C-alpha cells in the first residue's frame, strides 16, 4: 500500500462451545450481591443463592 | 493491589503488537486485543470477523 509493505491479520469465527464448570461437596458456590469488609473482616450477603455449577 | 491484598499472576497474556525497535517514528506502540467481551455474548450464531 502506497509503495510500502502492508500487513493484514484476518480472523473469522463461526464456532462457539458451551461449557459447564462444577465443584463437588463439601464445596459450594455463593452467588449474589456479596459484600466484603476488610476492616471488620466480614462477608455479608442478602438473598444469595447456593450453587454447584 | 489494594487494601484487600495484592494478587499477581505469572502466566503469560497474549496480545498483538509491533516491535518498533529499529524502526522509524511511525511505528505504533499500542497493543491490541483481537477479541472483546461482546464477542462471547452478542450474536453467538452470527459469523464474527476481525481485521487488523
Amino acid at each position, epitope marked *: 500500500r502506497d*509503495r*510500502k*509493505p502492508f*500487513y493484514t491479520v484476518d480472523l473469522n469465527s463461526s464456532l462457539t462451545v458451551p461449557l459447564q464448570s462444577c465443584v463437588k461437596p463439601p464445596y459450594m458456590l455463593v452467588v449474589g450481591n456479596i459484600v466484603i469488609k476488610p476492616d471488620s473482616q466480614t462477608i455479608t450477603c442478602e438473598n444469595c443463592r447456593l450453587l454447584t455449577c | 493491589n489494594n487494601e484487600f491484598g495484592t494478587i499477581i499472576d505469572w502466566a503469560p497474556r497474549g496480545q498483538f503488537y509491533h516491535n518498533c525497535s*529499529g*524502526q*522509524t*517514528q*511511525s511505528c505504533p506502540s499500542a497493543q491490541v486485543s483481537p477479541a472483546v467481551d461482546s464477542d462471547l455474548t452478542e450474536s453467538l450464531d452470527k459469523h464474527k470477523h476481525k481485521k487488523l
Partner: antibody
Amino acid sequence: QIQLVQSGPELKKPGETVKISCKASGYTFTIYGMNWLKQAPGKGLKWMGWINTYTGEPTYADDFKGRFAFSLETSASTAYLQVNNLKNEDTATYFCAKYYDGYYGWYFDVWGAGTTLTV
Amino acid sequence: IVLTQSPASLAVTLGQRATISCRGSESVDSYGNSFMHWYQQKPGQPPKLLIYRASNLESGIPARFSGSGSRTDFTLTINPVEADDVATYYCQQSYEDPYTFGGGTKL
C-alpha cells in the same frame, strides 16, 4: 512537492562551531523524522543519525556520538545540526534527507541540496 | 553489516548491458522483504534513489533501470547504456544501524 533546502556554504576554522539549517516544505514536519548524512569528498556516504521531530529526541551513530548535536525548530519546520570543536577530519558535505517511511524504511528518496564545509 | 560492491569501476560502451554486484556480511531479508537499495549520484548533486527494496523501480526513473537480488546477493542492470549514466552507483542497507551505504562503482 517535498523539498529540503539547506544553508549555503560556510568557511570556518578549528575550534569554532557551525550551525546548519534544513527547512522542510511540502509535508507535516511532526510525522517525519529528519536524517543527517555526511560525505567526505571522494569517498562513500555515512549515516550520522536522526532526530525525532515528534519528541525532539536525537539519536547518533556509533562513529558520530562524540561532538554532534541535533536540534530542530518545529514552528519553522527547520532542523539544526551542530558540530563543536571542528577538526581537520570534518571537511565534508552534509546532507539532510527524508527517509521513505514504513517497515525498515531507512532509505532516502528526498535529499537536501547540500552544504559544503571546510575547516 | 559491511557491504562489498563489485566491480570498483566498470567500463561499458553504449548499447551494452552493465551489471553491478553487491554483497553483505549478513542477510537483509525481513518478513517477505529484502531491504537492499540502489542509488545514483552525479558529481555535484545529491544521490537519487533508483531501486528500493531490491526489486522496485522508483517513480520517475526511466524504465531502462531494473533491479534484482536474492538473499545477501543483489545486482543492478542497465541494458541500454546512454551517455547520461556516467555516475557512481551505491548499494545501501536499511536493515541495521547505521544503515551503511556502499563504497561505490564507477561507470
